[PDB]
Amino acid sequence: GSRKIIHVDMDCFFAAVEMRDNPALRDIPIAIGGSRERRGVISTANYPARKFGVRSAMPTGMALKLCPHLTLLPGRFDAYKEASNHIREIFSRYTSRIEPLSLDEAYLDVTDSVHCHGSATLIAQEIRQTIFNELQLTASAGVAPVKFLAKIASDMNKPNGQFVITPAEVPAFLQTLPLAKIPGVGKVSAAKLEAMGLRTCGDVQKCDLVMLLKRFGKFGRILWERSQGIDERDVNSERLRKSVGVERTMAEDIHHWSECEAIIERLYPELERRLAKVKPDLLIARQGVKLKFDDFQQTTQEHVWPRLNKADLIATARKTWDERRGGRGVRLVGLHVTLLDP
DNA sequence: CTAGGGTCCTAGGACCC
DNA sequence: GGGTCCTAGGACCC
Ligand SMILES: Cc1cn([C@H]2C[C@H](O)[C@@H](COP(=O)(O)OP(=O)(O)OP(=O)(O)O)O2)c(=O)[nH]c1=O
Ligand SMILES: [Mg+2]
Ligand SMILES: [Mg+2]
Numbered sequence: 001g002s003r004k005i006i007h008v009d010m011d012c013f014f015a016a017v018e019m020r021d022n023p024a025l026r027d028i029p030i031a032i033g034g035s036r037e038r039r040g041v042i043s044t045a046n047y048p049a050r051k052f053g054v055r056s057a058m059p060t061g062m063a064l065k066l067c068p069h070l071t072l073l074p075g076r077f078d079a080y081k082e083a084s085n086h087i088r089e090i091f092s093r094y095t096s097r098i099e100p101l102s103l104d105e106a107y108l109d110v111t112d113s114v115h116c117h118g119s120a121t122l123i124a125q126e127i128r129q130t131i132f133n134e135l136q137l138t139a140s141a142g143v144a145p146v147k148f149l150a151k152i153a154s155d156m157n158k159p160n161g162q163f164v165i166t167p168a169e170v171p172a173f174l175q176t177l178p179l180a181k182i183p184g185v186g187k188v189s190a191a192k193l194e195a196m197g198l199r200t201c202g203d204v205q206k207c208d209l210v211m212l213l214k215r216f217g218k219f220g221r222i223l224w225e226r227s228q229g230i231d232e233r234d235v236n237s238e239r240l241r242k243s244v245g246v247e248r249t250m251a252e253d254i255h256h257w258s259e260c261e262a263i264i265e266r267l268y269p270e271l272e273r274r275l276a277k278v279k280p281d282l283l284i285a286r287q288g289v290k291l292k293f294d295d296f297q298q299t300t301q302e303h304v305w306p307r308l309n310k311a312d313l314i315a316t317a318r319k320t321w322d323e324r325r326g327g328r329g330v331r332l333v334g335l336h337v338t339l340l341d342p
Numbered sequence: 343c344t345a346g347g348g349t350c351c352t353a354g355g356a357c358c359c
Numbered sequence: 360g361g362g363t364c365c366t367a368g369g370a371c372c373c
Pocket of ligand 3: 009010102104105
């Protein structure tokens with residue numbers, strides 16, 4: 001009863017799209033991200049920029065200190081969505097069992113596939129080659145019996161490569177696998193695990209599930225399972241979007257309600273346009289606002305509401321401004337909607 | 343020097359039975 | 360004295 005799971009993941013996605021569409025950028029360091037003057041961060045960088053240490057989520061000021069010649073690009077999201085739709089269509093030539101996780105990646109369950117004599121290795125290779133042939137972008141892939149191992153494997157031979165983990169190989173692979181490599185084990189969890197002597201899956205294997213449950217709750221069961229190669233999560237294919245948000249960080253902090261209200265007036269039309277694409281009648285479950293202060297604390301306040309309404313979002317932002325700000329400057333204003341459940 | 347797009351989990355009181 | 364809704368926060372993912 002062993003499944004075959006592929007994880008396909010585009011290489012340096014946004015940057016690879018920009019280098020294809022403008023070959024002038026192929027061999028200089030580039031990154032998509034907000035300017036230093038906009039208090040931006042890097043969305044991603046090409047390999048010439050990564051060589052200097054430039055990474056996703058890095059503050060753009062730090063990126064530019066590491067790489068003074070970095071070319072900063074704003075981003076063309078319709079171009080990325082176009083490439084995304086294309087690779088998902090390519091995935092569909094092989095199976096309907098597709099769970100996209102983001103624009104540039106997806107799980108595929110090819111257990112019941114007849115392509116390539118049932119070879120998940122050869123299916124992954126064909127998909128990667130077809131994506132290069134049709135989009136002139138490269139992808140990496142991982143092949144494993146369960147989701148999380150397939151996703152880890154897709155990183156091990158990138159760019160433009162793949163890695164296969166068989167059941168026979170799972171114990172040796174897990175023994176030294178750092179817990180931080182597990183999707184969902186982030187910096188905070190890894191530091192808590194490290195402070196109790198747990199670094200790798202091999203370490204967690206020597207642990208009592210009951211202690212893990214007590215110390216981490218439901219997350220402790222996940223850690224226990226994953227550390228043994230256990231991951232029964234099915235490839236879904238029917239997941240739907242549950243929210244839409246629109247937020248902006250200002251170049252300077254704001255200190256006056258008039259400035260906040262002015263920012264909302266620009267955010268609202270964008271929220272309405274994006275909601276309408278998926279809910280033409282604007283009917284929703286909740287709406288709300290987000291403020292982020294200069295001490296980086298953030299607050300949200302949202303409430304049951306039947307239909308997108310600008311004045312109520314202003315009114316709510318006014319309350320939040322008056323009630324939870326405590327005289328701090330504000331660096332971000334955001335609007336938010338929770339979608340009806342079907 | 344710290345984005346913008348999201349998902350998921352936790353947790354207290356409200357409301358219900 | 361349990362189940363679910365409402366709400367806020369926060370880790371985490373891309
Ligand atoms: C991680 C990350 C990605 N993104 C965007 C830009 C990425 O190109 C796109 C897909 O993310 P990833 O697949 O995580 O990264 P990548 O494609 O740029 O590089 P890699 O070859 O290592 O896979 O999502 C962000 O905007 N912010 C982020 O923090
Ligand atoms: Mg990628
Ligand atoms: Mg990806």
